[PDB]
RNA sequence: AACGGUAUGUCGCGCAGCUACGCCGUCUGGGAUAAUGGCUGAAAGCCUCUUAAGCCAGAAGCCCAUCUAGAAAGUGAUGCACUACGAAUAAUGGUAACCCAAUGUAGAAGACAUUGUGUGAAC
RNA sequence: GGCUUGUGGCUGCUAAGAGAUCAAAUCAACGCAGCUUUUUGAUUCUUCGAUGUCGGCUCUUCCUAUCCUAGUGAUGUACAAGUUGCUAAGGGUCGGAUUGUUCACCCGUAUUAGGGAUCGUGAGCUGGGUUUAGACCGUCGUGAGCCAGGUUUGUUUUAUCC
RNA sequence: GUGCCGAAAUGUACUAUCACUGAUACCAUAAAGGGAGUCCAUGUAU
């Protein structure tokens, strides 16, 4: 089970990585869902939104696409587009997908990976302009991005006191490490770190 | 203020500034300023006049524009109806 | 009456500009083109007029 | 154009889908926005509809045709009894929405509340429920989660409900201590309490804490949370009339009278393409039954009820009691009430919650003087002749 | 005669119920935009709303606030019941329900609501 | 219905002048280039073991090439009333006389736009018109008979299936 | 044909592009006419 610490990144080129090793068999969490980042002007990413939102059945619009305003099934319905979800076996691999808008309790623990060429600074050049998941899900409505902000500021709160503990012990660790070398010899240190 | 014959009111004590009866109407204009930027008038010396100043000129300058903006007349040619608060000098608050 | 020496300001805003013949739009009294991009930035601009 | 005639939409599209509600008392959407500081202060209420009256007000409009004239205005009349806090509730704010942080109970409960969590109490022989009475887990468990309340959970909610109040049994006299009491019911039947939950809008969360658990386990009356001269939003279920037809639903025009099949109808159900019937269209179902908020409704007085003075005005130095001579459908109304000007929501004998309205008129009609000069009491079957059963002795009094 | 039948009796008035030709409510502030108007300011030692970066003002329109429906969004609170920093990217059995019996706050049937030793029903 | 756009409708580019004076406030020739499918043609691809054909009545939704309402710019814009450009389709856009009418035209009012959905809508209506068999008039034909020439009487079925 | 749906290089080397915009023959439309937007550029004068 990964988690994908998903803030710097593309949409479409974080889907596009992400349901590819859904279909090769594999549990995938991302987090901080508002923090991926679209091409355009705040202008320009809120227009093709609003776009979206005429496209309703006219006979009925319970029946009609959804409009999810949340960046969590933005970002869900942006992989569901990249995977046979009709199927049994994409809807096996859509399944174990999992979006999260700040990264919840649970998996503040895991190793959260990055992948590297979905990074908006390698796939975009510099001079253009980006926007937020976050900044255009609030204009469109989304409520709870206000709330999300100050959790984040909780949690990072947390974190940097788990970071100074975690100094401390690999700071007595190289101390430890450097009585350890003249044990075992002059010749025997440089095979550990040149090899021989 | 540039006007003839309808005279206008203010009103300020530092960060905020207010209007009354301009080219005639009882409502008021109101506008609020950023943090650092100083508004205040005094009709002795002054009169009929506003003075603005403040450190940086992004956050003055943007209030003379905003200020210009409320007088703005509709369905009346401006030519003839000229009226408003128009900026006179663009100084220095103490030249040393 | 108006004062005389306070007109300059009121007409440096409002009588002294330039205008479109397209557009229809503000301008500076020195100005070559048309900033609006329907139109296509159209460079034809008269001064506004005079009227009494 | 394509029409051939323009004309407004029949019926509204925002009230869909126009459909039963199986909610017993008007079930509130939102709160007003606290305003933070300030006191807590408790905002809805439950009051019952018992009927309706008309008064004769006098009014002080500026700069209107009616300055210094008197004006017949009719009024409905909620029967409000005093109200009981048992429970105390926090929502801590998530990304998903506000989700609760438990709910506190207080040291006892009254069987009202019982009755809430059972449909069949007659058959019912261990009645068990909420035994919460055992000492040891009840004291202890409390202060660890109003504990809790305090670290996370922003908003702070009361749990409350209506008092049925207790009596004794047919011919035992009452007011003696070896006659068994049991539960007599409204003036609609039951005695299972409608309990809500209610938001309090003071600022600080601790603060709130410190007076919803000065309210608890304590009655509330109407006098310290509405007063008169207050903007008040009505909430409550309408008045229930079954199926019906396309042109009384939505008031549509009937056809031709030289119709084939009849002219109780809509014709056209609509176009070839797009092939299908469409939302919009006026369609035969159910009407009435229907849950509404109303806004602006103003609270011309507020009751108390052996002097029985509440009927009468300043004027007049007669007393009158406010039920009309005869009592329609409904009861006497022998406690706190509120005069709310104009209609009200729903049927006689419907439980209405009140709210307090979210945000501020700005319009002369919302700060008017109230003055009353004089109030309607005539019996409503039909033509009322005498206001009072004194007036009658007095135009009438040798009879047989 | 009284009190009734029949002509689905005719006329007069008529609670209740529904109903309009009657009566009450329709408050109220944001955010980002479209046109467009401004500020600072280069390109172009001048000058320019940006035709460049940045900032402001901005529609009965769009999205929120309000109001209607609502967990096969198969959710939740309460009662009973069985393995790790962060930031940038021109950077650091026994209960319970339902049947049943009324009632109406309601109803085509289902359902919903309330009560079932109590003035609940009938008188 | 489709393709096509001559014809109809709508809009550019250019200016030769009207506009007192002054081409471009507003009109716009002689020309040239487009868009539209709300007119009518052209065609014969689909339907002749049948898609019920005109108008009105009733109800819905959609388009904008905006008349009004919201906001803005120009002017031969003093005021008022106007002419005109841009963004905007949320709301509003009507009572009647004659006519089968669509359209037109008058009287009257709260100032006043035009369109689409099988020329929306017949197991929703109506049947005035169009288009049978009765009958009359007029021209034409020796005659039977004919006539986008006129007039009058003339049957509008079924849902219980998905 | 080679981001993912979708089998196969988001390949290497070299030039342009900001626009509610562009994107692979037949093909599913766009013209005359404009633009100190940007890149490349012809001839002259200072």
């Given amino acids: 089970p990964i988690v994908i610490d998903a803030k ?10 992400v349901a590819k090793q859904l279909l090769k068999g594999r549990k995938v969490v991302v987090v901080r869902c508002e923090e991926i980042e679209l091409n355009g002007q705040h202008k320009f990413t809120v227009h093709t939104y609003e776009r979206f939102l005429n496209k309703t059945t006219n006979s009925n619009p319970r029946d009609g696409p959804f409009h999810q305003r949340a960046p969590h099934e933005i970002f869900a319905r942006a992989v569901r587009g990249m995977i046979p979800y009709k199927t049994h076996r994409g809807a096996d691999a859509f399944a174990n997908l999992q979006c999260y808008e700040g990264i919840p309790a649970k998996y503040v ?85 040149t090899f021989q | 203020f540039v006007y003839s014959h309808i005279k206008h009111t203010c009103s300020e004590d530092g960060r905020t500034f207010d209007f009354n009866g301009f080219m005639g109407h009882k409502e008021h204009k109101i506008v609020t300023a950023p943090e650092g930027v100083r508004i205040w008038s005094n009709e002795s010396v002054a009169k009929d006049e506003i003075n603005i100043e403040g450190a940086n000129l992004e956050d003055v300058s943007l209030v003379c524009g905003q200020i210009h903006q409320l007088t703005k007349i509709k369905d009346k040619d401006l030519r003839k109806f000229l009226d408003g608060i128009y900026v006179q000098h663009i100084e220095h608050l103490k030249e040393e | ?19 479109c013949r397209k557009c229809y739009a503000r301008l500076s009294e020195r100005a070559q083109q048309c900033r609006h991009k329907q139109c296509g930035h159209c460079k034809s601009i008269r001064p506004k007029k005079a009227g009494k | ?17 126009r459909g039963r509600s199986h909610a017993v008392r008007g079930r509130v959407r939102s709160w007003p926005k606290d305003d933070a500081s300030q006191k807590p202060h408790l905002c809805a209420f439950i009051g019952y509809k018992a009927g309706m009256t008309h008064v004769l007000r006098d009014v002080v409009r500026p700069n209107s045709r009616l300055h210094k004239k008197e004006a017949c205005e009719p009024v409905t009349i909620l029967e409000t009894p005093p109200m009981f806090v048992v429970g105390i509730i926090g929502y ?9 942080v438990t709910t506190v109970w207080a040291s006892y409960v009254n069987e009202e509340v019982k009755r809430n969590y059972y449909k069949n109490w007659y058959q019912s022989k261990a009645r068990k429920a909420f035994s919460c009475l055992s000492n040891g887990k009840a004291a202890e468990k409390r202060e660890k989660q109003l504990e809790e309340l305090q670290k996370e959970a922003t908003v702070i909610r009361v749990i409350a409900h209506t008092q049925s109040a207790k009596t004794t049994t047919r011919g035992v006299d009452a007011n003696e201590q ?15 309490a409608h309990m809500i939950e209610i938001q309090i809008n003071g600022g600080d969360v601790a603060a709130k804490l ?31 009339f079954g199926w019906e037809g396309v042109i009384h639903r939505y008031g549509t025009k009937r056809l031709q009278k030289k119709t084939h099949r009849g002219r109780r109808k809509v014709a056209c159900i609509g176009p070839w393409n797009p092939a299908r019937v469409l939302w919009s269209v006026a369609r035969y179902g159910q009407r009435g039954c229907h849950h509404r908020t109303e806004m602006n409704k103003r609270i011309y007085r507020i009751g108390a009820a052996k002097i029985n003075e509440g009927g009468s005005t300043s004027f007049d130095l007669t007393k009158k009691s406010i039920n009309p001579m005869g009592g329609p459908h409904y009861g006497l109304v022998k406690d706190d009430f509120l005069m709310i000007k104009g209609s009200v929501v729903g049927t006689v004998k419907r439980a209405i919650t009140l709210r307090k309205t979210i945000n501020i008129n700005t319009r002369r009609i919302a700060t008017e003087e109230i003055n009353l000069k004089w109030i309607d009491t005539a019996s409503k079957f039909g033509h009322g002749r005498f206001q009072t059963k004194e007036e009658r002795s007095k135009f009438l009094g040798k009879l047989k």
């Fill in chain 4, 210 to 240: 410190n007076y919803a658990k000065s309210i608890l386990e304590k009655e509330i009356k109407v006098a310290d949370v509405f007063t008169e001269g207050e903007q008040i939003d009505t909430i409550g279920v309408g008045k229930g």
């Fill in chain 4, 92 to 100: 801590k704010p998530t990304v998903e929405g506000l989700k609760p």
């Fill in chain 1, 109 to 193: 623990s895991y190793k959260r990976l990055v992948i590297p060429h979905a990074l908006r600074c390698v796939s975009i050049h510099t001079d253009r302009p980006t926007t937020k998941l976050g900044r255009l899900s609030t204009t469109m409505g989304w409520k709870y991005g206000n709330v999300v902000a100050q959790l984040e500021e909780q949690r990072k709160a947390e974190s940097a006191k788990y970071f100074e503990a975690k100094k401390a012990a690999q700071d007595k660790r190289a101390a430890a490490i450097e009585k350890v070398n003249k044990q075992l010899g002059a010749q025997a240190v440089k095979f550990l770190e």
């Fill in chain 3, 1 to 19: 009456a108006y004062e005389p020496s306070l007109r300059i300001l009121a007409e440096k805003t409002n009588v002294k500009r330039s205008v």
């Fill in chain 1, 8 to 17: 710097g990144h593309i949409q479409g080129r974080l889907a596009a990585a």
């Fill in chain 4, 1 to 17: 154009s394509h029409r051939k005639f323009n004309a407004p939409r029949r019926g509204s599209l925002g009230f869909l889908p």
């Fill in chain 4, 178 to 192: 070896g006659a068994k009491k049991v539960l007599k019911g409204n003036h609609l039947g039951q005695k299972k």
